Design a protein around this ligand. Sequence first.
Ligand SMILES: Nc1nc2c(ncn2[C@@H]2O[C@H](COP(=O)(O)OP(=O)(O)O)[C@@H](O)[C@H]2O)c(=O)[nH]1
Ligand SMILES: [Mg+2]
Lengths: 85, 168, 147, 100
Amino acid sequence: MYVKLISSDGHEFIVKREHALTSGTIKAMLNEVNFREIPSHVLSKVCMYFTYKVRYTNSSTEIPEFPIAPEIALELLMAANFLDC
Amino acid sequence: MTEYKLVVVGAVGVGKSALTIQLIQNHFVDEYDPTIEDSYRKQVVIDGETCLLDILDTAGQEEYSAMRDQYMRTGEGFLCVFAINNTKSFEDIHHYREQIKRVKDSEDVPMVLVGNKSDLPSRTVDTKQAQDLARSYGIPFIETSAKTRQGVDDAFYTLVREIRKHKE
Amino acid sequence: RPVLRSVNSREPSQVIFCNRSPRVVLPVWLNFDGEPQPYPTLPPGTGRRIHSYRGHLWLFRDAGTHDGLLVNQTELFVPSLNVDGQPIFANITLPVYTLKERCLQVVRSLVKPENYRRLDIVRSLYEDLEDHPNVQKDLERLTQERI
Amino acid sequence: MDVFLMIRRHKTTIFTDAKESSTVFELKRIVEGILKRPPDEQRLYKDDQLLDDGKTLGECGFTSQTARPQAPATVGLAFDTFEALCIEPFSSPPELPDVM
Ligand SMILES: Nc1nc2c(ncn2[C@@H]2O[C@H](COP(=O)(O)OP(=O)(O)O)[C@@H](O)[C@H]2O)c(=O)[nH]1
Ligand SMILES: [Mg+2]
């Protein structure tokens, strides 16, 4: 099962639905969802975070830090707030 | 002139008070009130440097309050002292050390281990184990005895040396 | 009275604090009245042999930001009884922060509070920016979650 | 050992994982299930290198250290005849504001 996540600049991101359901706002919008305020460089980071969360949730050992470049910080913050994740 | 604030800690009956007075008034005191805790100031010379020692002779029951924590927190160096005739003192050294590390908020606090009453013939802990434990702590050990007054000044001056090393 | 307090057990327990996080770890001990008491910090990747007592409550935070951390894959830590004198191990790690909280962390490290609201973001994020991690608020949350 | 990858083609990006032992052909099957093209009409790339659908992912250079969940390694995808490997790039973040 997979979901398509379209960005504002037209990039199509295919992720497992279970991973995209991490976002409360995505789970609310439910197999193709478009975001007109999120560029590709932000939606890619959000998808990477989905995989990171699903991989390391309830892990038994150490967890790596989630890297966020300063230049993306603000945009990723706004996207996260809007996506509820 | 640079000041050095020293604090002498240990169990009741180890000889902290007598040792402290031996550093200053230059006389061994056979019996001191167990309840009297006070500070003393003395101008001395260590390696030529004219230092001012401020020595708090701790005494009294346990108090792990904020006020006692801050009072001990002002200590720059600590004399964890035990008596070779009392096993409990050598066991308690560890607890006193952990309390120092807590109030100073560091694992490295200037201190010197002291084995007192080296004039008494009875030995419950020899001079050898104390050096081993100090090695595990990373501090010097001095086997000074307030009664014979051998090595007392060595102990206090070694604490000033350890403080100087920590400040540099 | 508070549910999240340490027990006055007076029974020694040797514990190992292992900082398996990239952050500087502040150990926080809950005293017998439940109040958080900070203890000396652990640099990242450091293991330290500490001495505690049975039934004592411990939690671990980021020393600089008070961000939440995990110990043995849970929030709070209580030493067990030491079998045959071996030390108990306290593995301190990162949790899976929410993406919002992680981004708020990094933005807090870049901007200064004086300039927080001068950022072109929704006003809702300004208060979230000034709402720094709080040990007491997390204690309230944990207490009610036990309830 | 798991490797976390985003296989990309044009403006499309597929996020998926695999085993370091997983071979290039099994990943091509994975992409068949999603983009509806058999491991016949497609060719996978590591950087500019064409991957032979018989070697394992780890044999191509995909390690756990270089293909993390939070930083997946990229695998290019190209579909009579094939097409030039074309991966349309992501957007760029703005100039970092004054306050940071
Ligand atoms: N033989 C001997 N007795 C000592 C020595 N130091 C202290 N004492 C005795 O131990 C007793 C208790 O010591 P005190 O000064 O009161 O230690 P404090 O109460 O813990 O500060 C005193 O009556 C001293 O006479 C020492 O070096 N040798
Ligand atoms: Mg006394």
